[PDB]
Amino acid sequence: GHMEQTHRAIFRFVPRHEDELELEVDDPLLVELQAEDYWYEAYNMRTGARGVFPAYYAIEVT
Amino acid sequence: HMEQTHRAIFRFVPRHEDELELEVDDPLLVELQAEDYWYEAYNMRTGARGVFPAYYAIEVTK
C-alpha cells in the first residue's frame, strides 16, 4: 500500500507501556491520529509497528 | 538542596498511572535519569511525582 510519511521522530522513545510505539531518531512515521491529549497514534514505517507516543517526539515532514 | 534541576518544554498529559503531568515551564526536581530516556521527577509547581519522556525537559544551568 502507498504509505505517505507525515512525521519524523526527533528523539529516541523507549516504551515503558504496552500501548507505546518505539522510536529511533529519524524514524519515518505515518501519524494516524493526533489526539487531544498530545499523544500521537502512528505506524512506524521503519519497524512496521503501531502504537502511541508523545506528540513532540515527532515533527511534520512539511 | 531540594532545588530545581529541569524545566518542562512541552505539554505532557499522562495516559499511564506512573506518569507526571507537565505544562510548559514547569520546574522539575529530577530524581532519576533512567537508562530508557524516561526521567522520574517531582513537579515543583503541582507537587506531583512521576515519570515523563526525558526530552520533554531541559536542564537548568543552576
Numbering used by the authors:
A (entry chain BBB): 487 to 548
B (entry chain AAA): 488 to 549
What sentences appear in the manuscript?
Aromatic residues cluster in the core of folded proteins, where they stabilize the structure through multiple interactions. Here we capture ring flipping events of a buried tyrosine residue in the SH3 domain of the JNK-interacting protein 1 (JIP1).
The SH3 domain of JIP1 undergoes exchange between two distinct conformations, as evidenced by 15N NMR relaxation measured at multiple temperatures (Supplementary Discussion). The 15N and 1HN relaxation dispersion data were analysed simultaneously according to a two-site exchange model in which a highly populated major state interconverts with a low-populated minor state (Supplementary Discussion). Aromatic 1H–13C heteronuclear single quantum coherence (HSQC) spectra show averaging of the NMR signals of the tyrosine ε1/ε2 nuclei of Y526, which shows that full 180° ring flipping occurs. During the structural transition between the major and the minor state, a void volume is created around the ring of Y526 that corresponds to a pocket expansion of 65 Å3; this is mainly due to the structural reorganization of the side chain of Q520. Notably, the transition from the eclipsed, major conformation to the staggered, minor conformation is associated with a structural change from a rare, classic β-bulge to a common, canonical β-strand conformation. Breathing motions along the structural trajectory between the major and the minor state generate the necessary void volume for fast ring flipping of Y526 to take place.
